[PDB]
Design a protein around this ligand. Structure first.
Ligand SMILES: O=[N+]([O-])c1ccc(O[C@@H]2O[C@H](CS[C@H]3OC[C@@H](O)[C@H](O)[C@H]3O)[C@@H](O)[C@H](O)[C@H]2O)cc1
Ligand SMILES: O=[N+]([O-])c1ccc(O[C@@H]2O[C@H](CS[C@H]3OC[C@@H](O)[C@H](O)[C@H]3O)[C@@H](O)[C@H](O)[C@H]2O)cc1
Lengths: 773, 773, 258
């Protein structure tokens, strides 16, 4: 929202007051209160006929400092509020001296300068990481529309860059952008987002959560070019500065505070296929495609029924179309017996044509206007109404339908929509419609998650969710939305992907080839490799099945090759997924997140790290030309085994069975002995692979159990020309490959054999020590 | 301006119509006209009750395709219009087939697809570089405010970045930004710009001029994230696609089309010093500060009299304050005797207090409101009015006042202000006030320039100009405005300077340490190095004197060092200045402009190239830490002589006498023998320096005369271990230093002598040959 | 109320939508329900982001066919309602075929045409006595004053004249007149009436009760010159076609009914 009119003027009609001078500081237990005047009040004659700001500084978690800046406290302030985890007993330091008032939590302090020169500074071990300079916060009275706002502008340093604010499809680095945190259904091609989060982080190793579920208007270097401005229509503004000093450290703190990503079941990491949208579904049709996959040796793990499992104009009323699906439970059992898991499409709206609509209207379960009439429109479905998830009895009705599906053998749900939540309404519970707009997505998705958790169990729970809000990362997986079938669109999708992990979400799915019914085969092929080198991977079209043999034999070879690869990568991939759950480290990581000290990484948005150890760079051309950056180190191609040195850009040409997938040096990586399914016993048959172990280094590999705990650890340590290998825990019949090493001087406690990728050592005793040439 | 509401919807109250189907194509001599219906009009029953668009394709210069898209022709469409160089006999090719209509100029063509699938494509040698997809242009009927607009959206590809749009201070790459081309006085810290230009260029080697002097609203990947959208309130839209294929080639065609930078005189490249803003000037005071410079051996070339040469509240009336300035010409001629050029402050407004105000009001020389009263406000000066430069007698009055000052010894002018031009007015010539807002900057400066052309002569003409519009690059030098004194402000300024170069401006000046009275010394010193390694360089304060001895002795050393350096660099610098005049290649280049095929350079904004061969990275920290990227090659520090290998980032620490200033490999550089003034005979006493000449390369060095023409060329070519040096033209008593070469095998036709930087070779006969060891 | 602006245009700021294609028919005991889309929804790609009309056909009394056309059911719809005598047990026939959906009470049927060429026809023993042509009913969204209306236009044949609409003092035959059914104290010499009734009959031996106690706005051949248009500020419209085949017989059924 524009406040200034250049450096020198203010927007017409706006009156601003700022905290300009500390009047008084009070310590109130473990909180520091600062009273700040909008003018010089050092003399008693000015100590009246003036506003005063009340600033409270508190810490909900270690290394998080909350700042609340209030004008009037008599305002109503209804919920909902974000599902923050707030501790009451965090150890803090408060020092109130003649020159400063300073509140400290962990290494992060907020310091306010007393006297004539006001300043609010955020420090890390006493070094300023950002702050608010005088006249850059306060209260805005808009005499044009009689609304009042609070605002802040937090400084950016030279070269400081901003990331996050939800899953967004604009340029990855946010400087120069205005962003409004307001869920919308705008596709994947605009400034709009389905999943808005009023959290940003920077390449200086801190983050900020602006604690308002309503729309927050961010001007990120777009009003004042070297500040992040945010404003909200409220009598107070509350934000939280979150220390790092690294991006992963910020997200660990942010996810402890707002919710940890759940760990999804291993089966969910396989290939999903759907009915497509406006095609025709029935059991025979579904089985021709399922058998088609199997005939071509294309592994398939999850099958999804889309909207037309229900009758047109009646969505979402949970009634199976009886023409198309005369025996829904029998059909799903027959698919399950093949080893498939089952998903169905849901959303939180209902068309008036549904016979159940009248029941809901009579029971009061639908969202109402203030006059008590139903809120209705004709977008999506005719006479559409919204389920009022603030009405406990409505929640129960909805949950019971979901339970009926699960009871029939449905394993998971696509929690679609949830964005276009009106404000000219009265919620059952009387909450603030401005805040409910975004928080609806959380309540909806929580409701569905809990059905799974109470039925199949939490270990088995998973969604494909289109909308989100703060805290909803606890209910994975989040799905990137509707895309066009072209390379520009594939690129903007990956920006959305990186962004959502920069906003606290550990897992991200998307649809290979997008949604547009005719993709060129080359786009579909490139996008398959990206899709299967992502945490979660789906094939889903519009007017026809997204099956590879729609294109060519080669597209089938591509789907098979990368599906096999991901399955074999699972002992690695699932350990990296447990990190998302433990520390909020997303699986798909922006280069800046993994290599925060490398200035070549600040703007890299066409490549990513998949877990700690592998760089992937999708190919965005038919011809196969791709340029990418490698950070310092000698990297090795995951299956070509060619090496590249880092701290520079590289240019290559890849065919459709290839793309840059480079493994860091000093890495020990576990591949499994199953290329047909993701869910199998990873610690038996394990093939370990050691890449560029330098002298003085140690590489650790943790193989997880089904629940993501570490069941076996292998370590390879080099001193001189001797590498010492030690394993701890449970594993059977494993092997260690010395990538690109053709010959060894000697080996204690194992046998050896040549391979194309290098010597394969088999252990017996554990020295497993190997001696290099 | 927002047009869509996400992918799926339109903003409330907007009615859109698009060209969707070719109805008829007509060649009109050297122009192609397309008639395009917004619906299917194949049947005659639909060939009525429909709008029709008229698209005209034409070529003003080789390699530029103009695209005029029209709704109603009956609109008034008054001027002004931009000062475009339009040829009528450009060789073009027009092809009209069953499938396509295609208009071609040089390698660039516009092709429109017939039949069902409308497309508008810009092709370079038949390969699409950008385009407009169906429904991404057309007419917007805004039913909320009864305004009508035309719009276009030109596609961006994967990793395609956007640059330019005037001198702006937001992030350098424009993707994610809205920009409005509307001159404002907003400082140097916001999204506002004094110098707006509706031209952008990309890292794909083309550019586009939107040919509208009104406000043009650009959504640069900010509405549709992979398109540049532009709209204007008009019944037609006209734009020009300008081919490269290289950034420099685009700016060449752009500056031929809209105007070439003039070649400023060599004295102008010296050190400018000002009175400062609110100092109490008087002959003695002024001379004491000029004497202080000379006493400390700080070379000084231009002195500027700021606002207070005139009486308070009477700016700009051209009357010397008689109490302060009893003898203006006597004073200025005394100052000139000391070897100085003289600049004075001017602007295009006048305060009511001035005696001259009533003269002008009575003559009708001031801008009027439609009722005949004067337009006035109290911003800047009390009851400030504006000189109506559409009134030819008003222009004559003002030019005569300028001629009076030049007759007194004034050499040049600071053309300040020009931005805040109201639209609630009636111009003498009846122009469109909406177009005059920006174009005023042009007329104002053009008039002042011509006074100079007509007095001191074209070769001697130079300005410091604060505002600009298209064409005004003809009237150098453009001055970057009012800056706060901190490192962030410093970095903002550099983005603005780099941006102006990417908008057709060949020269850019700025003030060392900014404007604000108390910068720390460390900032002043850092900024000093940056200022003197720019085309144009000035010292100017607010309340404070901007003399370095205010700070410390070291501030004097820094000033001296970098002023000596710039003067020694003039043989190099002035040749690069002529490139700006001949081709529109700016002196200060964004890295992407010089190294367009290096993907490391896309977002680089804290460093630049200063001409062809030297990279400067200012230091934006007190401690002296700086990180910079070097392109491929072995680079050499210009005076430290240390070498660095490229294609990578580097981290260094520099004291106040240093920064990264690296010379490219295979370079022959001319240094001059005067460190006291920029204007001397560069071709006598020249010190050539040869940097890392590789086997099978040649380095050329062109030494210019005072008019920018080449007076001497030196070439060094290496094959094996023989380097052959060849001189052509007029030079005297020059030398060749073999940098980092201490010892050589032999020399034919030359003598050698040691030096700390390398072997210095003096010619005799010019069959000069060096054989390496 | 003015809806059209001559044959070719619509009043500025009114957005219209019409039932133009049968999507589905459903028989619900002795009632027939036709779901009708405002555009072509034969293909699943188009079976979303569209309004849909719900028409219900029912018979309160033999020889009376009730027709309720509905946009949104979410509206409050408080009373009072007219004191109608409504039977639940009237003998009717419902015939749903590839060509038509037809609902018959006595000699009177309502028939809707399926496929490309929507039509709503009222037949007496299979001959058409009136009906509604495509785009002559539907929903009016008035963007000028933020109110919404439902409307219908029932055809008049050559020489067909209209009567009733209460105790009115204008020309007896209603053709050419607009009439607002809103009680007023305006004397006996004006367009106003003390005694308003939204019921008309014609010299073709049928009548029609528009079943709304609020103001009902009739354009009785006064907008479309050969149709009786009627509109009401409501999310639904409900009217009853009443067979004769003589004026006295209509009146017999009308007074049994009301
Ligand atoms: O059946 N058609 O091909 C048809 C198409 C468009 C139409 O548009 C309307 O034509 C109307 C009548 S056509 C007019 O011009 C052509 C002659 O053949 C007719 O006799 C004359 O009345 C115009 O008055 C309206 O303003 C215009 O909207 C009419 C008919
Ligand atoms: O391909 N079609 O036949 C099609 C039809 C209507 C469409 O309309 C849009 O559907 C959009 C997305 S589709 C959605 O539901 C069906 C699933 O198959 C998708 O995966 C899911 O995102 C909605 O979000 C928009 O609000 C709506 O206007 C889109 C596509």
């Amino acid at each position: 929202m524009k406040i200034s009119d250049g450096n020198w003027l203010i927007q017409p009609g706006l009156n601003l007051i700022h905290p300009l001078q500390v009047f008084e500081v009070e310590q109130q237990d473990n909180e520091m209160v600062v009273y700040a005047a909008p003018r010089d009040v050092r003399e008693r004659t000015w100590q009246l006929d003036t506003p005063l700001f009340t600033l409270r500084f508190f810490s909900p978690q270690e290394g998080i400092v909350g700042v609340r800046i209030e004008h009037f406290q008599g305002a109503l302030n209804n919920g909902p509020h974000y599902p923050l985890n707030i501790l009451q007993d965090v150890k803090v330091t408060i020092e109130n001296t003649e020159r400063y008032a300073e509140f400290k939590s962990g290494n992060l302090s907020a310091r306010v300068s007393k006297g004539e020169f006001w300043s609010l500074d955020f420090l890390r071990n006493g070094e300023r990481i950002t702050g608010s300079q005088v006249k850059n916060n306060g209260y805005v009275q808009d005499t044009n529309n009689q609304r009042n706002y609070m605002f802040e502008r937090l400084d950016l340093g030279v070269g400081e860059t901003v990331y996050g604010l939800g899953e967004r499809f604009t340029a990855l680095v946010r400087n120069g952008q205005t962003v409004e945190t307001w869920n919308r259904d705008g596709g994947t091609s605009t400034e709009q987002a389905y999943k808005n989060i009023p959290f940003y982080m920077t390449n200086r190793g801190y983050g900020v959560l602006v604690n308002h579920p309503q729309c927050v208007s961010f001007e990120v270097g777009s009003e004042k070019v070297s500040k992040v401005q945010f404003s909200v229509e409220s009598e107070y503004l509350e934000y939280f500065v979150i220390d790092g000093p690294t991006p992963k450290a910020v997200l660990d703190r942010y996810t402890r505070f707002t919710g940890r990503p759940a760990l999804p079941p291993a089966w969910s990491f396989g290939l999903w296929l759907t009915t497509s949208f406006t095609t025709n579904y029935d059991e025979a049709t579904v089985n021709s495609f399922i058998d088609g996959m199997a005939e071509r040796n294309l592994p398939l793990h999850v099958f999804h029924f889309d909207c037309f499992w229900m009758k047109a104009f009646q969505w979402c009323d949970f009634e199976w179309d009886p023409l198309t699906f005369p025996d829904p439970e029998g059909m799903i059992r027959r698919l399950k017996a093949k080893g498939l898991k089952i998903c169905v499409w849901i959303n939180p709206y209902i068309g008036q044509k549904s016979p159940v609509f009248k029941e809901l209207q009579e029971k009061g379960y639908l969202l109402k206007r203030p006059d008590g009439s139903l809120w209705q429109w004709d977008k999506w479905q005719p006479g559409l109404a919204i389920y009022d998830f603030t009405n406990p009895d409505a929640c129960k009705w909805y949950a019971d339908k979901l339970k009926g599906l699960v009871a029939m053998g449905v394993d998971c749900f696509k929690t679609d929509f949830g964005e276009r939540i009106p404000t000219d309404v009265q919620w059952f519970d009387g909450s603030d419609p401005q805040k409910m707009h975004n928080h609806y997505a959380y309540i909806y998705n929580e409701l569905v998650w809990n059905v799974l958790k109470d039925t199949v169990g939490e270990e088995e729970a998973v969604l494909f969710a289109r909308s989100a809000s703060v805290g909803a990362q606890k209910f994975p997986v989040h799905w990137g939305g509707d895309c066009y079938a072209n390379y520009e669109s594939m690129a903007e999708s990956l920006r959305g992907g990186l962004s959502i992990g920069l906003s606290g979400f550990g897992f991200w799915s998307h649809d290979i080839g997008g949604f547009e019914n005719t993709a060129p085969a080359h786009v579909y092929k490139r996008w398959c490799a990206f899709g299967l080198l992502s945490s979660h991977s789906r094939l889903h079209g519009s007017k026809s099945y997204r099956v590879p043999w729609a294109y060519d034999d080669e597209s089938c070879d591509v789907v098979r090759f990368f599906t096999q690869l991901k399955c074999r990568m699972m002992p690695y991939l699932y350990r990296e997924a447990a990190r998302a759950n433990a520390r909020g480290t997303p699986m798909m990581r922006a280069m800046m997140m993994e290599f925060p000290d490398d200035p070549a990484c600040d703007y890299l948005d066409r490549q990513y790290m998949l877990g700690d150890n592998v760089m992937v760079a999708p190919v965005f051309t038919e011809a196969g030309d791709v340029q990418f950056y490698l950070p310092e180190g000698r990297w090795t191609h995951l299956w070509h085994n060619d090496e590249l040195d880092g701290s520079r850009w590289h240019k290559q040409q890849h065919g459709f069975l290839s793309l840059p997938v480079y493994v860091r040096d000093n890495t020990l990586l576990a591949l499994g002995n199953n290329d047909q399914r993701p869910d199998y016993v990873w610690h038996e048959g394990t093939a370990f692979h050691l890449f560029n172990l330098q002298d003085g280094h140690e590489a650790v590999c943790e193989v997880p159990a089904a629940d993501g705990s570490v069941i076996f650890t292998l370590k390879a340590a080099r001193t001189g020309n001797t590498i010492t290998v030690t394993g701890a825990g449970e594993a059977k019949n494993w092997t260690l490959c010395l990538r690109n090493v053709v010959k060894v001087n000697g080996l204690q406690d194992g046998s050896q054999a040549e391979s194309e990728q290098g010597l394969v050592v088999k252990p017996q005793g554990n020295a497993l020590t190997i001696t290099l040439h």
